[PDB]
């Protein structure tokens, strides 16, 4: 009751920090994603844009192997044509906005690799379940 | 023959029945929750209220350990300050509206307990997965 617990900022709090300081709390930006006669359609087209951009990322998240785990390993290797950076730097030197600039060409190649690497593991799980 | 209309009830069919017969069929209340120029905007503002109140309970469900499993055990204990009743009744004496009157003060403390009991299990599961 003395109130001694630790608090870790709030929305977009670690948005400039390094990866080693950004991955402790990702959930705070996660939970503020659904709740929070002509000016009702500015309410309507803000609501069906909010629920639309929530469902598109929850669907691209949903169709990989990661239902709601929010951080998950996968099986695809890291081709050095994507980033060519050292591993020991890019988790404590840089920050996320330089990464999103540093990789934005190579997205939609990674998402197709992730979907095929999930569906191949999916049918191989089915082929495992089929033999027994 | 096989197949009769006696025990195959409908929407809100067991709404007066006991907990042991209402938890038998929860899907019937589940499926009638989403489907079923100025009187079209009363359709629009009814639709985006239906899909909004579906996503809010599916989000409060989502952030616990129960993604879409619809019946799930958890790890938090049952503090007897809430109900203090014996178990052998609460599957055959009351009905659901009698439970909901009997507990309605104690919601939103329990809902705060489940999120912390999930997210503690989430990062402790992650710390278990990181070392191996």
């Amino acid at each position, epitope marked *: 009751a003395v*109130g*001694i617990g630790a608090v870790f900022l709030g929305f977009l709090g670690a948005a400039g920090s390094t990866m080693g300081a950004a991955s402790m709390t990702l959930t705070v930006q996660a939970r503020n994603l659904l709740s929070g006669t002509v000016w009702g359609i500015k309410q309507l087209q803000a609501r069906v844009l909010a629920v639309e951009r929530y469902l598109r990322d929850q669907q691209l998240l949903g169709i990989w192997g990661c239902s709601g785990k929010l951080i998950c390993c996968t099986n695809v290797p890291w081709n050095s044509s994507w980033s060519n950076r050292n591993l020991s730097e890019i988790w404590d030197n840089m920050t996320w906005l330089q990464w999103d600039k540093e990789i934005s060409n190579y997205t939609q190649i990674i998402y197709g690799l992730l979907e095929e690497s999930q569906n191949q593991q999916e049918k191989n799980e089915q082929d495992l379940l089929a033999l027994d | 023959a096989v197949g009769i209309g006696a025990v195959f009830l409908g929407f809100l069919g067991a709404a007066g029945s006991t907990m042991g017969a209402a938890s038998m069929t929860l899907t019937v209340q589940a499926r009638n929750l989403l489907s079923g120029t100025v009187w079209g905007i009363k359709q629009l503002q009814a639709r985006v209220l239906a899909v909004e109140r579906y996503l809010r309970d599916q989000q409060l469900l989502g952030i616990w350990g129960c993604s879409g499993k619809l019946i799930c055990c958890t790890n938090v204990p049952w503090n007897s300050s809430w109900s203090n009743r014996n178990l052998s009744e609460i599957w055959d004496n009351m009905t659901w509206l009698q439970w909901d009157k009997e507990i309605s003060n104690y919601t939103q403390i329990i809902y705060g307990l489940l999120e912390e009991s999930q997210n503690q299990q989430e990062k402790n599961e992650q710390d278990l997965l990181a070392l191996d």
Partner: antibody
Framework: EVMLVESGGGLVKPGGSLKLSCEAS????????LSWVRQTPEKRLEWVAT??????????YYPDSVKGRFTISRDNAKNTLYLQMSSLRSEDTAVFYC??????????????WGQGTTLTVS | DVVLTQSPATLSVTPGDSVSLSCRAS??????LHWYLQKSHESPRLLIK???QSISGIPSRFSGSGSGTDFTLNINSVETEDFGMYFC?????????FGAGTKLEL
């Protein structure tokens, strides 16, 4: 992982001064409230000092028996906790533990304990 | 100050039996109660936080209960590794105080 390693313990004459250190790793140091708690040779546990974390308000707390004598401090840039002791008494003799608290409302508990450093005042 | 009274002070039990340890507060600490085990030559380790919620890594045989001033730690099949000194702790008010501990012997 979370590491807390205390140093600086020793044999001190009464009336003397001694600075303890606690080196922490594995967490965002400044955000957590940290404490020193001591365990007496008869094994009793006595809270000694607390300094709140950066998002906790950063204040210090002491029991009356040590106020004006004991000082808890932190150097967040180096992830180190300090305990400054002055006007030491023979009753201060104990193993001193560095401890890290939990998170949020249910985080006033001690979450991590150090190995301890021994202070003997005689 | 809140006085925490742990009972019994010392207790010898055979491995496999179950025990109930009492902690009584001089004022209400309704959910402010944590349990720690300190085995010989070791630092204390948190077992149970805020009366009853279990902690990852603590065995399921450890259970807590109680509300207000009266709290109980159940150990429902005691193992050899469980023997040691047991402390309760309150965070309801300054200064922080401990119970005297139950020492569990084999």
């Amino acid at each position: 992982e979370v590491m807390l390693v205390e140093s600086g313990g020793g044999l001190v004459k009464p009336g003397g001064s001694l600075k303890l250190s606690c080196e922490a790793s594995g967490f965002s140091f400044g955000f957590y409230s940290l404490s020193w708690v001591r365990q007496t040779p008869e094994k009793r546990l006595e809270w000694v000092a607390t300094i709140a974390g950066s998002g906790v308000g950063g204040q210090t707390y002491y029991p009356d028996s040590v106020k004006g004598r004991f000082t808890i401090s932190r150097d967040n840039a180096k992830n180190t906790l300090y305990l400054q002791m002055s006007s030491l008494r023979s009753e201060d003799t104990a193993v001193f533990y560095c401890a890290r608290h939990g998170e949020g409302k249910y985080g006033s508990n001690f979450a991590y304990w150090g190995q301890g450093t021994t202070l003997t005042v005689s | 100050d809140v006085v925490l009274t742990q009972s019994p002070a010392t207790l010898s039990v055979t491995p496999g039996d179950s025990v109930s340890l009492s902690c009584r507060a001089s004022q209400t600490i309704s959910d402010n109660l944590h349990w720690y085990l300190q085995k010989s030559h070791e630092s204390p380790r948190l077992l149970i936080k805020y009366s009853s919620q279990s902690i990852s890594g603590i065995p399921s045989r450890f259970s807590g209960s109680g509300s207000g001033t009266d709290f109980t730690l159940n150990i429902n099949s005691v193992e050899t590794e469980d023997f040691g000194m047991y402390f309760c702790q309150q965070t309801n008010s300054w200064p922080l105080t401990f119970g005297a501990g139950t020492k569990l012997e084999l």
